[PDB]
Amino acid sequence: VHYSRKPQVSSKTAKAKIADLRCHYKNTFETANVINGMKLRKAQQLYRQVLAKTRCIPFKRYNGKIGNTAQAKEWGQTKGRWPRKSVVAMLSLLKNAEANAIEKGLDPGKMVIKHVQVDQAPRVRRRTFRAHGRITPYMRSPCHVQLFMTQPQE
Amino acid sequence: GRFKPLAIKKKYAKKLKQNRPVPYWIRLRTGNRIKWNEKRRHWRRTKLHY
Amino acid sequence: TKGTTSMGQRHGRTHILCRRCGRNAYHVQWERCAACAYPRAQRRRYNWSVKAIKRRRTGTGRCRYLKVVHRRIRNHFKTDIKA
Amino acid sequence: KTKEAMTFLKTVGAIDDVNRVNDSRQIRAGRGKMRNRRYVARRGPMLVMPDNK
Amino acid sequence: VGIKCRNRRKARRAHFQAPSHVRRILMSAPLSKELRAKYNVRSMPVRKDDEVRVKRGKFKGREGRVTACYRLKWVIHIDKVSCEKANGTTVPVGVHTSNVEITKLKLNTRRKAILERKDRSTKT
Amino acid sequence: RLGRIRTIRKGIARIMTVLNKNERENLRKFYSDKKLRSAKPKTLRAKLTHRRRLALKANEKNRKTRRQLRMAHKFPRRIYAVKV
Amino acid sequence: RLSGMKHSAESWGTGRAVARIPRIHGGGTSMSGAGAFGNMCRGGRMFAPTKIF
Amino acid sequence: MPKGNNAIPHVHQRKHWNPCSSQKGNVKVFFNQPAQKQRRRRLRLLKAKKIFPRP
RNA sequence: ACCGAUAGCGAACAAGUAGCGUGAGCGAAAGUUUGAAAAGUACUUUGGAAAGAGAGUGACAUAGAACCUGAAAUCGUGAC
RNA sequence: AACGUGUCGCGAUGGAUGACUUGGCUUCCUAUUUCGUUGAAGAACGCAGCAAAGUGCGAUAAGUGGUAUCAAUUGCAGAAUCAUU
């Protein structure tokens, strides 16, 4: 798995990857994204913060009918959700990386996330009975996450 | 129903023994293309019927 | 209804299994393995279903013995053992 | 004796053309190979016998 | 003059189909130059026990004795050449005859006998 | 998997095989003494095609008639040769 | 002799939202209804079958 | 279709019993003939051999 | 002087199987590690667990059992 | 800020691709022509150290026997077993 982007300095950055996660992918994109996604500084603090003292997680891509929330203020926008499922994941993810920051020796007191790359992984199938006997797929979109963390300094 | 002839008795028996994981020890050998216990019967899917 | 309830009514078991060929089509009451046509002392096939014919045509089994005939014939019957 | 024969034949000619021969022998690339044409080669000079002995 | 193959598909097929008995036949060795020179055989079919040298492959030039002859995979395990398994366990490699050459043979009656025919077919 | 038992049973095959072999042939012998019948049951008397079991026995087939026979005597045809 | 050509397949006709061809007869197969006989079908005839003379 | 002035409306193979995806049937090619030739020949010669004293 | 895994037999495959249909019958899908081999990733270490990160292997793992290649559609990313 | 747009590198995604190809598929030959109520074919169910399948086999059940040959077989078993009978 040649995952992601060419990532610098063998000295101080750290790589993990996990596959096919079980949250709806697009959704998860917006989950991931707040950490990564953007634009630097906003992404970095918030992960340290939702994930170390907050709830609503921003969304700004997917459409539908999609609820409105004041929490979207967090964004200056109108979508974010609070979808539990994902969240859990996110926490894990950091964490191995962090234990790897022991082994790399990096300062876990302030590591920074750069370049997460979150990808659609191959989808789950199953079936439903409709009137007159018609059947549709009711399918599923899991996740690919691969993560890097930076923390050089002055 | 309640009762169900010896022949009938045979058909399940023969099948059951097949309805479980292929003998693993076999699997291990040299050149074992061996996907899985293909033909395994099941019941909440696959009534044997009749 | 028309169907599905009446799909409730399919407790026919209609045709059952057979002796000679097995499967099914065994009419109980007028007794026939459609297939082997057991009862009857010969067996059935028709043209049209040629594929079926192939499906039944010998070898498909095991010609258990007959197989061996080819060896044996070819082994031309010099008989007995060498000793 | 093959050698005897050939040698003169070489001397008298057979070297280049002959050497194209045997040596321009390649496995037939492409599928004819896989319809059993495995190798190919060119052709080189002709002796005609009245009959061979 | 019969001017072709000797058709590969069939042939190619046949090889894969080699029985036990047959494997043994097919597998013959170059005989040691010396050994060749000795009994005056061309090449000779294997069996356990005996001694060989690695010619080519990536691992050109390795040498050793026959432990084991695994015909299905067409292998010789030769003694004291091995690979290590991660664990720390040596696991012997295996091998094909024509890139090895037999240095030394085990000779019983049967051996002697076979040898005789062979040696003959070269030598006599 | 004190695996050795298979062989032992296979040994059983061997006595058993033999045994019938003997008996069977025992039997065969004591059947004869007449050119035919009951010497020796069919199962002592070895199947050999429907046709092969059928067939014209050679006597009756080669043992044709006087008319021919005389004739045969009269018109043999072995070798001649011609050219000149 | 009759390569390809082999299901008891029939053309389904018109009104069925679809090109009007032969289709496989049978269910479950998940060949179920798949286009039949000819040329254009999977494993089928080809156009112009391959003639003896 | 092309313009060529040629020899009117013909060509024949696209007629009866030329077994199609149907089946039929009345078949009798001569391609056997090499083989056949040989069959005549090989036999013939081989026959001779057997008969042999005979004119 | 055939086809090349949607081809080619139905069927390269435990296929006329599986499957399907009351039954008659209908009757599929389904290919390849290794310049050489499992040498099939010990070990560390985090990780409930998967797993991860290391490591470790091996030319090559953009070769880690989805094994040749790896096309296009579609998408994240980078980068703009 | 947004969405799009774009590039490209790279990554995913997919299973293309080529290359292979015991597969198909055709032609042509030999034959000491070809079943079975003497119980065939086909059917059934059975049988392995550990076997599901396949495959083999038929309670003499993954077989015996003869004969031929002449040390393997290996997933793990097993056996010192080669002057060997």
HEC sequence for chain E: CCCCCCCHHHHHHHHHCCCHHHHHHHCEEEECHHHHHHHCCCEEECCCCCEEEECCCCCCCCEEEEEEEECCCCEEEECCCCEEECCCEEECCCCCHHHEEEEECCCCHHHHHHHHHHHHHHHC
How many Cβ contacts (< 8 angstroms) between chains D and E?
Answer: 6
Q: Which residue has the tokens 């062989």?
A: F7
Q: Which nucleotides of J are covered by protein (CB under 7 A)?
A: 2-4, 9-14, 20-30, 32-46, 48-54, 60-61, 63-67, 69-78, 82-85
Q: Which residue has the tokens 């078949």?
A: H27
Could you give the CA distance from residue F7 to residue F4 in angstroms, rounded to a whole number? 6
- Residues written for chain D: 53
Give one word for H23, left, alpha or beta, with left for phi > 0 and alpha for psi -120 to 50.
Answer: left
Q: Which residue has the tokens 């043999």?
A: F76
Give one word for G29, left, alpha or beta, with left for phi > 0 and alpha for psi -120 to 50.
Answer: alpha
What residue of H is the nearest CA neighbor of G45? H21
Other Cβ atoms closer than 10 A to C34: 15
Q: Which residues pair with C15 in a beta bridge?
A: C27
Six token digits for residue C29? 């009451």
Q: Which residue has the tokens 């096939």?
A: C45
Q: Report, in angstroms and rounded to the nearest whole number, the Rg of chain G calculated over CA atoms.
A: 12
**Short-list C40, C10, C37, CA closest to C26:** C37
Q: Indicate if the alpha-carbon torsion angle G11, G13, G19, G24 is positive or negative.
A: negative
Q: Determine the 3-state secondary structure of C63 from DSSP.
A: coil
- DSSP labels for D9-49? HIIIIIHHHHHHTTTS-EE--SGGGGGTT-EE---------
For residue B14, CA distances in Å to B8, C70, E88, F9 come to 10, 33, 45, 25
Could you give the CA distance from residue A80 to residue A14 in angstroms, rounded to a whole number? 28
Q: Residue F58 has what DSSP assignment?
A: S
* Strands, E assignment, chain A: 14-21, 57-59, 79-81, 112-120, 127-129, 135-137, 143-150
Distance from the Cα of residue A152 to its chain's centroid: 23
**Short-list A48, A127, A34, CA closest to A86:** A34
Q: What technique solved it?
A: cryo-EM
What residue of H is the nearest CA neighbor of G37? H21
Look up residue H48 and give its amino acid. A
- The enclosing H or E element of A102 equals helix A84-104
Give residues 1 to 40 of G whose Cβ lies within 8 Å of H: 1-2, 5, 37
- CB distance D38–E8 less than 8 Å? yes
Six token digits for residue E39? 């009994």
Q: Determine the 3-state secondary structure of A49 from DSSP.
A: helix
Under 8 Å between Cβ of G11 and G28: no
Strand I proximal to B18 Cβ, under 7 A: no
**Cis omega before residue C39 (within 30°)?**
yes
Q: Which residue has the tokens 């500084």?
A: A41
Q: Which residues pair with E101 in a beta bridge?
A: E53
Please enumerate in sequence order all residues whose Cβ is within 8 A of that of B46, keeping only pairs 6 or more positions apart, or say none: none
Q: Determine the 3-state secondary structure of A146 from DSSP.
A: strand
Q: Which residue has the tokens 């990532």?
A: A7
- Determine the residue among C17, C28, C33 to mutate to test chain B binding: the one whose Cβ has the most chain B Cβ atoms within 10 Å: C17
**For residue D38, which residues of chain E lie inside 8 Å, CB to CB?**
5, 8
CA atoms within 13 A on the CB side of G37: 14
Could you give the CA distance from residue A88 to residue A92 in angstroms, rounded to a whole number? 7
Could you give the CA distance from residue E49 to residue E29 in angstroms, rounded to a whole number? 14
Could you give the CA distance from residue F21 to residue F38 in angstroms, rounded to a whole number? 19
Could you give the CA distance from residue A17 to residue A93 in angstroms, rounded to a whole number? 9
For residue A130, CA distances in Å to A136, A140, C2, H17 come to 8, 19, 18, 51
Give E114-123's long-range contacts (Cβ < 8 A, gap of 24+): E114/E45, E115/E39, E115/E41, E115/E44, E118/E39, E118/E41, E118/E42, E118/E44, E119/E39, E119/E40, E119/E41, E121/E41, E121/E42, E122/E39, E122/E40, E122/E41, E122/E42, E123/E39, E123/E40, E123/E41
Strand J proximal to B33 Cβ, under 7 A: no
**What stretches of chain F show up as alpha helix (H) in DSSP?**
5-29, 50-53, 59-62, 66-74
Under 8 Å between Cβ of E106 and E49: yes
Could you give the CA distance from residue A12 to residue A150 in angstroms, rounded to a whole number? 6
> To the nearest whole angstrom, how far is the Cα of D40 from the nearest Cα of chain E?
11
**Short-list G53, C80, E9, CA closest to H14:** G53
Q: Which residue has the tokens 């996110």?
A: A90
Could you give the CA distance from residue H32 to residue H43 in angstroms, rounded to a whole number? 15
Q: From the C1' of J35, which residue's alpha carbon is nearest?
A: C66
**Short-list F81, E61, E110, CA closest to H55:** F81
